[PDB]
Design a protein around this nucleic acid. Structure first.
Ligand SMILES: Cc1cc2nc3c(=O)[nH]c(=O)nc-3n(C[C@H](O)[C@H](O)[C@H](O)COP(=O)(O)O)c2cc1C
Length: 312
RNA sequence: GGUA
């Protein structure tokens, strides 16, 4: 498991279509699914929810839930689908998370978190990891954070992805990634205190240069919004992070997405399910706005063909 | 089944 660089799990963003796009930009970057509730995996259509392309490796499935047995079985199923890692969501502050007692509100019950992780760890052979916040209600302490890390490590967890801020359950989800202050220094300190463990820091990191800064202090960096707002924020990732002699081209990626789009349309996928994630491919580039316009207006393969000729 |  290479922890150096990852794209954050993002509901309504990091579905298989956007993940495929990102993979065209960076071969090395680690991909995460949208948060997927365990009940959905158990009772829903597992193909629709879990199926992914082999090119997406390395890829982790993120699960949400509160019941050890349900999550363990969901992890087992996730493993069967070929995911390289089962990630436990411990950071979602949504109203639905609060009603279902999952996500960030699990940090109130370390005993429960430990039995969840133990059950998950015994159900699969792939790494079981966590994505967490610094605490709840802005009442977090460094000792409290370290204690939670210890509890989870006792349960077998080695990889800790930390959104380096508290969660304020009274605020909206959007506000919960803007208002609570970031404390990346705490994640830096965790690595200093738990050298044997793997720490990936997350929150407000806008560029590869900024990621490189943190990579001097922690094992990895996870980027969310910056990547969706402009996938080519990862343009130099393969070369500067992963030491690969590879540099993507926006036009090459766009051409690959066209062939991808044709395959998907073939099997019933709505064109917009793919195109809606391609709007920022030319962010801040010449004709980038017309590109967005053409795709958003046409929402079809024919529209993509017009945009491609525009950018050729 | 699901964090503007
Ligand atoms: C639209 C959106 C959806 C998100 N969905 C998830 C999710 O499903 N699971 C999760 O652990 N975090 C989710 N998050 C939080 C991100 O993973 C990440 O921790 C947060 O955006 C801060 O990182 P960033 O500043 O690089 O974007 C989501 C964030 C956004 C903006």
């Amino acid at each position: 498991l290479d922890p150096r660089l990852s794209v954050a799990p993002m509901v309504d963003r990091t579905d298989r279509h956007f993940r495929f796009l990102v993979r065209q930009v960076s071969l090395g970057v680690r991909l995460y699914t949208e948060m997927t509730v365990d009940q959905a995996v158990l009772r829903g259509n597992r193909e629709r929810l879990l199926a992914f392309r082999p090119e997406e490796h390395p890829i982790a499935l993120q699960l949400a839930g509160s019941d050890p047995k349900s999550l363990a079985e969901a992890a087992r199923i996730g493993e069967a689908f070929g995911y390289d890692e089962i990630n436990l969501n411990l950071g979602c502050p949504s109203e639905k998370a609060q009603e279902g007692g999952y996500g960030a509100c699990l940090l109130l019950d370390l005993a429960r978190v430990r039995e969840i992780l133990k059950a998950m760890g015994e159900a699969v052979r792939v790494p079981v990891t966590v994505k967490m916040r610094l605490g709840l209600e802005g009442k977090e302490t460094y000792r409290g954070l370290a204690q939670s890390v210890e509890a989870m490590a006792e349960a077998g967890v080695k990889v800790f992805v930390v959104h380096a801020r508290s969660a304020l359950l009274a605020l909206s989800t959007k506000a919960n990634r803007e208002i609570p202050p970031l404390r990346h220094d705490w994640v830096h300190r965790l690595k200093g205190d738990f050298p044997q463990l793997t720490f990936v820091t997350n929150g407000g990191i806008r560029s590869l240069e900024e990621a490189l800064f943190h990579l001097k202090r922690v094992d990895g960096v996870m980027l969310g919004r910056a990547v969706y707002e402009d996938p080519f924020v990862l343009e130099e990732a393969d070369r500067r992070v992963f030491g690969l002699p590879r540099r993507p081209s926006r036009l090459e990626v766009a051409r690959r997405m066209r062939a991808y789009l044709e395959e998907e349309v073939l099997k019933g996928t709505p064109p917009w399910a793919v195109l809606r994630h391609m709007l920022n491919l030319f962010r801040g580039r010449p004709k980038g706005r017309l590109w967005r316009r053409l795709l958003s207006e046409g929402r079809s393969l024919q529209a993509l063909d017009r945009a491609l000729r525009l950018m050729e």
